[PDB]
Design an enzyme around this catalytic site. Structure first.
Site, PDB file in Angstrom:
ATOM      1  CE  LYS B  57     -35.864 -22.410  -9.232  1.00 48.26           C
ATOM      2  NZ  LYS B  57     -36.881 -22.423  -8.163  1.00 48.26           N
ATOM      3  CB  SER B 279     -43.112 -24.887  -3.025  1.00 47.70           C
ATOM      4  OG  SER B 279     -41.809 -24.595  -2.504  1.00 47.70           O
TER       5      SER B 279
HETATM    6  C1  LIG Z   1     -37.608 -23.678  -7.751  1.00 50.39           C
HETATM    7  C2  LIG Z   1     -38.533 -23.756  -6.587  1.00 50.39           C
HETATM    8  C3  LIG Z   1     -39.230 -24.966  -6.358  1.00 50.39           C
HETATM    9  C4  LIG Z   1     -39.192 -26.179  -7.272  1.00 50.39           C
HETATM   10  O1  LIG Z   1     -37.867 -26.691  -7.431  1.00 50.39           O
HETATM   11  P1  LIG Z   1     -37.434 -27.236  -8.899  1.00 50.39           P
HETATM   12  O2  LIG Z   1     -36.107 -27.920  -8.745  1.00 50.39           O
HETATM   13  O3  LIG Z   1     -37.387 -26.055  -9.855  1.00 50.39           O
HETATM   14  O4  LIG Z   1     -38.508 -28.215  -9.312  1.00 50.39           O
HETATM   15  C5  LIG Z   1     -40.110 -25.004  -5.294  1.00 50.39           C
HETATM   16  N1  LIG Z   1     -40.259 -23.902  -4.480  1.00 50.39           N
HETATM   17  C6  LIG Z   1     -39.569 -22.721  -4.651  1.00 50.39           C
HETATM   18  C7  LIG Z   1     -39.838 -21.561  -3.712  1.00 50.39           C
HETATM   19  C8  LIG Z   1     -38.690 -22.629  -5.744  1.00 50.39           C
HETATM   20  O5  LIG Z   1     -37.956 -21.491  -5.959  1.00 50.39           O
END
Ligand SMILES: *Cc1c(COP(=O)(O)O)cnc(C)c1O
Ligand SMILES: *Cc1c(COP(=O)(O)O)cnc(C)c1O
Lengths: 334, 338
Positions: B57, B279
């Site tokens: 981010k 994630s």
């Molecule tokens: C934002 C985020 C994602 C997903 O990325 P996007 O580009 O928003 O789809 C996955 N894991 C974490 C920890 C995130 O902050």
């Protein structure tokens, strides 16, 4: 205009290859002071860009990798160290990649956060009696070595020159990144691997570079005081490490625990750089150099060992500071 | 082999924002050692936690604020606002600190107290809303604030802002350059979808045949047209299809169970020494599933790793302690049939 970083143009073979080559970044917010001249450059080397977010990544890697190349660590042996901090994490990372079991001894009372990190890497934790502190952890390690000769490689972070030698890369990065313009380097001292390793490699490049060690005012052992209670995590070991070489250190600056924390708070607020406690100490010492008339126009490089996120359970961000930026900087410098 | 660490950057950065991006692409080895994965297929992770505040981010907070300043949507006197209890909050705070804008972050008072602390460190004003109301309560308050104070606030709007997607053309260029154009498959777990769409937009320009894979929680498979549901994969599974999502750019969507995402992340740190977040466990597992497909032998597979495990120490990520050898763990992760 503001350009983000370009592609690395490398595929790294494993995570250890991402260690080092850390960024050197200009300070601007906390240097906005009438007594610091436009031409004086104050730069911070951000060691939390390492894969496990501290300078010790370089140390854990070099100690383990050299021992393996050396035959001091061979198949069937395990790594051991008494440490409750970044060195333990760095050894766990190296051990995971190389496929060596890692044993970390620390008082049971310690960083349950860092304990979890170390367990996540597959470390065996040796939790020793809380009231005995680190001497108790060292004591247990020695007991394990005694009862199991041949089994363990001890990292020995305060006595192992593979620590110091890792920082020849740290030095080369400072030299290259500044195009040979670096004048002063400031390093808060824990094991002293950084200050000495940097000093010896830079002195090889340019004898006139000034090397400044930083230690807590409350435990100013490099300056000949006694071990005392302090709050600057990662520094002030309470003894002079065996790897320390006083000949390579030009000045020692003592910084009060509370001033180090207050500096770290100002750096994240005014420069957007989330440095840890020892970085607060180093940066304050660096700003104190930057206001000296004999240092006008010099390039000052300050080592930033770790990031504030590893300090959320501490008092680092608990105290609120009164006043405007200039008020805060005046209170730190006076 | 000889292990070589990184060379000097040969740059002095004017500020911390210049250190965003150019994140490393690292080969996986330990978790790829299963009979169903061929020696020739190359499985790489792009470690977005190398950004200055340790997540993908950083790119988004930066580009949203920078593009708004350049356009005139953000001007002196205005303040930044967003309802977010995740990484975007942190990234906005970092950008705001450097650019010299106040940042207002809204989130439920009970949600991520550690990153509340991080944001306040950066000088952010926290708008702490009723815990029981969740994120809708935070969005409601931001809505109230902007309604009452017309012209005062710039809303980041992470799920609808084209500057989010746009930031990932850089991510795409890095994948392209780092692989010398060899990249064949990109795997991205979807939160805002900035990453999977922005990467796809730019890579699909470079060569025909790059497969773009989105990853979402099995429990909340809204991209696949299933219903929103509770899941434990922090940072993804928003429960709706973001406004910046473009289905035309996505070749396949892979659902991953929460429990499997965690177990994968635990395996990656233990066997590869890479401390990826939740994630990332989802994205990596999906990536390994691609790597076992016969049609994918010899291909280069690039998996986005959005965050580091240290941001997850208060969760259940590392509380479950897997019994079994490496091969048992990997075999248990890949054993679903289809
Ligand atoms: C934002 C985020 C994602 C997903 O990325 P996007 O580009 O928003 O789809 C996955 N894991 C974490 C920890 C995130 O902050
Ligand atoms: C290790 C460390 C230091 C000191 O670095 P040395 O090279 O050991 O002197 C400073 N701060 C933190 C957080 C550290 O972990």
């Amino acid at each position: 205009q503001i350009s983000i970083s370009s592609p690395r143009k490398r595929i790294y073979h494993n995570i250890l290859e991402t260690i080092g080559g850390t960024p050197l970044v200009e300070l601007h917010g906390v240097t906005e002071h009438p007594r610091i001249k436009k031409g004086t450059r104050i730069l911070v080397k951000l060691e939390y860009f390492n894969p496990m977010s501290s300078v010790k990544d370089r140390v854990g890697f070099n100690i383990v990798y050299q021992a393996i190349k050396d035959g001091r660590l061979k198949p069937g042996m395990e790594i051991i160290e008494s440490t409750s901090g970044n060195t333990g994490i760095a050894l766990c990372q190296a051990g995971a990649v190389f496929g060596y079991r890692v044993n970390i001894a620390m008082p049971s009372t310690m960083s349950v956060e860092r304990q979890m990190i170390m367990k996540a890497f597959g470390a065996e934790l040796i939790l020793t009696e809380g009231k005995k502190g680190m001497p108790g952890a060292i004591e247990e390690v020695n007991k394990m070595i005694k009862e199991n000769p041949g089994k363990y490689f001890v990292a020995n972070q305060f006595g192992n020159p593979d620590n110091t030698a890792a920082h020849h890369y740290t030095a080369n990065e400072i030299w290259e990144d500044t195009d040979g313009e670096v004048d002063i380097v400031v390093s808060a001292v824990g094991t002293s691997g950084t200050v000495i390793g940097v000093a010896e490699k830079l002195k090889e490049k340019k004898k006139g570079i000034k090397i400044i060690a930083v230690e807590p005012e409350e435990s100013a052992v490099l300056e000949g005081k006694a071990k005392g209670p302090h709050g600057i995590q990662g520094i002030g070991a309470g003894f002079i490490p065996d790897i320390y070489k006083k000949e390579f250190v030009d000045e020692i600056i003592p910084i009060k625990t509370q001033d180090a924390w207050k500096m770290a708070r100002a750096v994240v607020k005014y420069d957007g750089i989330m440095c840890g406690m020892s970085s607060g100490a180093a940066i304050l010492a660096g700003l104190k150099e930057a206001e000296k008339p004999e240092n006008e126009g010099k390039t000052i490089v300050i080592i930033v060992p770790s990031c504030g996120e590893r300090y959320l359970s501490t008092d680092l961000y608990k105290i609120k500071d009164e006043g405007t930026k200039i008020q805060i900087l005046d209170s730190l410098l006076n």
